[PDB]
Amino acid sequence: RVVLDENGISHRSRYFIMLCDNETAIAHAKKTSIWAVKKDSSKRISDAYKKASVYFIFVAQQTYNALGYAQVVSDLNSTELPFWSDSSHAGGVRIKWIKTCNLFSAEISEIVSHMDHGSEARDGMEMMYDEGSRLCTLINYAIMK
Fold this sequence. Notes:
It comes from Schizosaccharomyces pombe (strain 972 / ATCC 24843). The chain is of the alpha+beta class. The chain has one domain (1-145). 32% of the residues lie in helices and 31% in strands. The chain has helices at residues 23-32, 39-51, 106-113, 129-144; strands at residues 13-20, 34-38, 53-60, 66-72, 89-103, 126-127. Strand 3 (53-60) and strand 4 (66-72) form a beta hairpin. The longest helix has 16 residues, at 129-144. The N and C termini lie far apart (29 Å).
């Protein structure tokens, strides 16, 4: 159906988690459709942009609240960083919001708790295709209730 690589990652659709820890960054992302990418995870995300459709799934760090998801629609850019970015960031990306929300789902939370091969998710991790598609479905289902 969807053909995966040896990592359980899709060739076409690739999903990274963004663990957000202040309301001011996420609110600004939601108005201006920009996000900043950590140097830590920047090489892998930038290479994913060049080969596949890339998606960021936004979750609150303290609570694991679903904040939404978006498609990344521009490559890494050091000049176009949002105001909240410190030196932990490589550059900005333009995004295209698909869903925005602010809510807690236990199913969503469970996936985020186990995302790092059974451990809690690390900011800017790539996840498996199955986790990505499941999280996007759960957000949609949660919003429509």
